[PDB]
């Protein structure tokens, strides 16, 4: 559903995740304005990964990484955790909105 939680198994082919995420670019919130934002996939850069698996698009909400809630994280901290994770990263997402 367009706000469902899916722990996506995002497998890195080589050059890290294909998702360029932001924490939240403050323009309110595409689902959570009164609530804190998590992390958002801003875009997909080739690689494979998100685009290849075909789950994540340029607007899905990232809640966490394998249950490690990204609440109050800046985009870098999210990605730092996404770099601490190995070849296949599990991310806890919610369906976002597309551009």
UniProtKB/Swiss-Prot annotation:
Subcellular location: Cytoplasm, Cytoskeleton; Nucleus; Cell projection, Lamellipodium
Tissue occurrence: Expressed predominantly in kidney and, to a lesser extent, in lung, heart, brain and testis.
Domain PDZ: 7-97
Signal peptide: none
Family membership noted in the UniProt record: Belongs to the protein-tyrosine phosphatase family. Non-receptor class subfamily.
Subunit structure and binding partners: Interacts (via the first PDZ domain) with PLEKHA1 and PLEKHA2. Interacts (via the second PDZ domain) with TNFRSF6 (Fas receptor) (via C-terminus). Interacts (via the second PDZ domain) with TRIP6 (via the third LIM domain and C-terminus). Interacts (via the third PDZ domain) with NGFR (via C-terminal SVP motif) and PKN2 (via C-terminus). Interacts (via the second or fourth PDZ domains) with PDLIM4 (via C-terminus only or via combined C-terminus and LIM domain, but not LIM domain only). Found in a complex with PDLIM4 and TRIP6.
Described purpose of this protein according to its UniProt entry: Tyrosine phosphatase which negatively regulates FAS-induced apoptosis and NGFR-mediated pro-apoptotic signaling. May regulate phosphoinositide 3-kinase (PI3K) signaling through dephosphorylation of PIK3R2.
Protein name: Tyrosine-protein phosphatase non-receptor type 13
Organism this protein belongs to: Mus musculus (Mouse)
Residues of the full protein shown: 1351 to 1444 of 2453
């Amino acid at each position: 559903k367009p706000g469902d939680t899916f722990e996506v198994e995002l497998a890195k082919t080589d050059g890290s995740l294909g998702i360029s995420v932001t924490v939240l670019f403050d323009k309110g919130g595409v689902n959570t304005s009164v609530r804190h934002g998590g992390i958002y996939v801003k875009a997909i850069i080739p690689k494979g990964a998100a685009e290849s698996d075909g789950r994540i698009h340029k607007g899905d909400r990232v809640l966490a990484v394998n249950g490690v809630s990204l609440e109050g994280a800046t985009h870098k901290q999210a990605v730092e955790t996404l770099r601490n994770t190995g070849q296949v990263v599990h991310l806890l997402l919610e369906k976002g909105q597309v551009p």
